Amino acid sequence: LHFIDQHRAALIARVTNVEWLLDALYGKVLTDEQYQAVRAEPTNPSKMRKLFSFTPAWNWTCKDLLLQALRESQSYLVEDLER
């Protein structure tokens, strides 16, 4: 969604469930070479910075698939960003 690109500074600093987000996005978007590249730089905002590093290669039908994974994982972070 454009929710992913509008809130890019908020999803770096305030997503704290990245290791579950990678499992939902695995196979559908993230290859195993992209999966292992995220699981480093152990500051938790830098795992999102590596995750948004692969986001310009994404289209609309899969950026909102990560919106579904944030709504299954958090359900309060998405709502606090919309409100």
Q: Provide the minimum distance between the beta carbon of 66 and its own copies in the complex, in angstroms, as a whole number.
A: 11
Which residues form the interface with its own copies (CB under 8 A)?
Answer: 5, 8-9, 12-17, 19-20, 22-24, 26-27, 29, 31-46, 49, 52-62, 73-74, 76-77, 79-80, 83
Q: Which residue has the tokens 């590249």?
A: 37
Q: Are 11 and 4 in contact (CB under 8 A)?
A: yes
Q: Which tokens hold the place of 53?
A: 């590093």
Cα angle for residues 26, 43, 82 (degrees, 5° grid):
65
Min separation Cβ 37 and its own copies, Å: 3
Nearer to its own copies, 3 or 54 (CB): 54
